[PDB]
């Protein structure tokens, strides 16, 4: 990955990446995008210097996106779920969809829908957690029931077996870097196995996935640009537009729209989908519209907290008004309400940012910048 | 409608067995997995017969501080007429709690008021000094009885004057004197008591108490 090349070089204190004399240079555009990507992941600071998080990611042998997710994953014993999600994403999708099954027989589609509703319990608006469900459900399926489980649930056995092996290997890498006894850690099947995550654990997981994919977050068109795209309760979910955070503003906004994939759990939801959605990537497949590979839905403040480490989030001046006193402790320390802006700056009309809900925050003045410390 | 009429939830949850094997590192050193991650004592204090009834009426106010602040297990055996205190290994935390509790019961046993006895639990530098009249001087018969009256004074005024001046508490049990207070304080009280035993009139002792009482405030 180009970001891996940049991440490694920055850990070597090599400053000039663009003009570096590579034997086989990557494209300058890719290097610039790669540098920008690392900043969003908090690996490189505003001056393009490696940070403490950045040094750790350089140690990992995985791509920086997955490396970032694992680093912030050692909280509230949610690591076993993240390892399952990262492993499942790396190997691939194990779900055989109705289109592949050619059933888009009436009894078989009912079983297919039942099998999908079987794995849909973790969260209504998230597809990545469904991917977590099958992987975790696998560990409790004994050897003699594997083929029945795959056949019953329309899953790919060989892809599933690869996932389980990757979980053990992936967990070893994380514990080795994080744990004090770096070399000595040994993985066990019992560590991989875990019970259903609690509701608070589910919310933390969505934040954890957001850390990997901050830049890959989309908002509905109705929120940012009401009436630019006609919306009604009658409109199906797959027809609801979304806009990525960093999409360039075309003369016509309809081009920048993205739409939910039919296979996603969001399709059968019926009700209005989440305003903010986190996607793995975009696919031009489908002549009508571009599709978004959804992972989970993030709320406003959770997005602000994750984007806080990166440079994709900008903060306003202290809000003042009814019950909005800016408590000030020292000349360089204050507490105030601020309306966060995520994405492009208001001055920057090329890229398409937006404003998040106001939140109380603690700010400390560093180098003339009221840098944020934590949300109150 | 009233007759007087005209005409997203942001979530608050924010992200903030040993292995029996060895691994050799690149220098060749071994590397092993991490290993898996107040004693029971008792004291016995025997209560004399004349302190049974005061202990009976004052028990409601005796076990709470011992059981709550000191985390001790309190019982008294009616058969032996003694108070038992035990350190509970699972709750007790202060190693000196048991000995501190025993002293508090001992002070009440000697004859001190309960509220004064609590000072032993509250503070850590209060002691009890004890001595007899015969140690100072061999007084017998009426001479001994007059000496006790001289220490107490009329209406106990002389005893209270010493207690107020020296910041102590005195129990005058027949020819046996017990003084409760700080180390420097009980020595000051002891001197005044001993002067009274040797024969000094109370009025002269009262004057010296006023002198030392003045000094005590400036320091």
């Amino acid at each position: 990955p180009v970001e891996s090349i940049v991440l490694q070089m920055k850990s070597m204190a090599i400053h000039n990446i663009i003009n570096f004399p590579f034997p086989t240079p990557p494209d300058r555009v890719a290097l610039s995008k790669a540098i920008q990507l690392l900043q969003y992941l908090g690996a490189l600071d505003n001056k393009e210097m490696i940070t403490e998080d950045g040094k750790k990611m350089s140690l990992f042998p995985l791509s920086p996106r997955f490396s970032k997710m694992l680093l912030v994953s050692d909280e509230k014993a949610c690591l076993p779920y993240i390892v399952a999600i990262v492993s499942a994403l790396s190997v691939g999708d194990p779900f055989i969809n109705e289109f592949e099954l050619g059933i888009n027989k009436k009894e078989l589609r009912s079983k297919f829908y039942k099998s999908r509703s079987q794995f849909s319990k973790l969260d209504k608006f998230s597809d990545v957690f469904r991917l977590l469900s099958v992987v975790s459900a696998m560990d409790y399926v004994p050897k003699e029931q594997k083929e029945i489980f795959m056949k019953k649930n329309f899953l790919r056995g060989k892809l599933m077996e690869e996932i389980v092996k990757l979980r053990k290997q992936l967990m070893y890498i994380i514990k080795s870097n994080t744990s004090k006894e770096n070399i000595a850690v040994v993985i066990r099947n019992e560590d991989l196995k875990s019970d259903i995550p609690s509701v608070i654990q589910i919310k933390l997981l969505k934040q954890m996935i957001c850390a990997g994919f901050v830049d890959h977050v989309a908002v509905r068109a109705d929120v940012l640009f009401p009436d630019d795209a006609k919306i009604t309760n009658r409109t199906s979910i797959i027809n609801i537009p979304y806009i990525p955070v960093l999409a360039t503003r075309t003369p016509n906004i309809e081009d920048c729209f993205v739409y939910i994939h039919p296979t996603s759990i969001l399709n059968n939801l019926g009700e209005m989908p989440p305003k903010y959605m986190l996607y793995y990537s975009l696919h031009l497949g489908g002549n009508n519209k571009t599709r978004m590979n959804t992972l989970c839905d993030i709320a406003s403040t959770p997005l602000a907290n994750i984007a806080r480490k990166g440079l994709l989030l900008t903060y306003s001046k202290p809000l003042t008004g009814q019950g909005l006193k800016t408590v000030n402790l020292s000349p360089t320390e204050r507490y105030c309400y601020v309306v966060p802006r995520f994405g492009s700056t208001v001055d920057n009309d090329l890229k398409i940012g937006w404003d998040l809900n106001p939140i109380a925050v603690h700010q400390k003045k560093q180098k003339g910048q009221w840098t944020v410390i934590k949300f109150i | 409608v009233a007759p007087t009429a005209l005409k997203d939830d942001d979530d608050d949850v924010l992200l903030d067995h040993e292995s029996k094997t060895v691994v050799v590192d690149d220098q060749g050193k071994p590397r092993f997995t991490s290993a898996s991650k107040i004693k029971f004592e008792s004291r016995k204090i025997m209560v004399p017969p004349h302190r049974m009834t005061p202990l009976r009426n004052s028990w409601t106010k005796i076990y709470p501080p011992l059981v709550e602040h000191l985390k001790l297990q309190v019982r008294m055996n009616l058969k032996t007429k003694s108070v038992e205190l035990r350190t509970n290994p699972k709750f007790t935390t202060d190693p000196g709690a048991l000995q501190k509790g025993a002293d508090f019961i001992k002070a009440f046993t000697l004859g001190f008021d309960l509220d004064d006895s609590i000072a032993l639990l509250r503070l850590d530098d209060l002691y009890i000094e004890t001595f007899e009249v015969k140690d100072v001087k061999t007084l017998t018969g009426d001479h001994l009885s007059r000496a006790i009256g001289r220490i107490a004074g009329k209406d106990g005024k002389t005893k209270f004057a010493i207690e107020n001046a020296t910041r102590t508490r005195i129990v005058l049990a027949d020819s046996k004197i017990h003084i409760l207070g700080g180390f420097t304080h009980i020595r000051m009280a002891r001197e005044s008591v001993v002067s009274l035993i040797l024969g000094s009139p109370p009025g002269k002792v009262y004057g010296n108490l006023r002198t030392v009482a003045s000094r005590l405030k400036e320091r």
């Binding site: 975790s136 | 059981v67 309190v74 019982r75």
Partner: peptide, 13 residues
């Protein structure tokens, strides 16, 4: 699977 009276008078107190 899941994914599918005087206290302490004569007795210790």
């Amino acid at each position: 699977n899941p994914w599918l009276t005087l206290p302490g008078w004569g007795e210790w107190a």
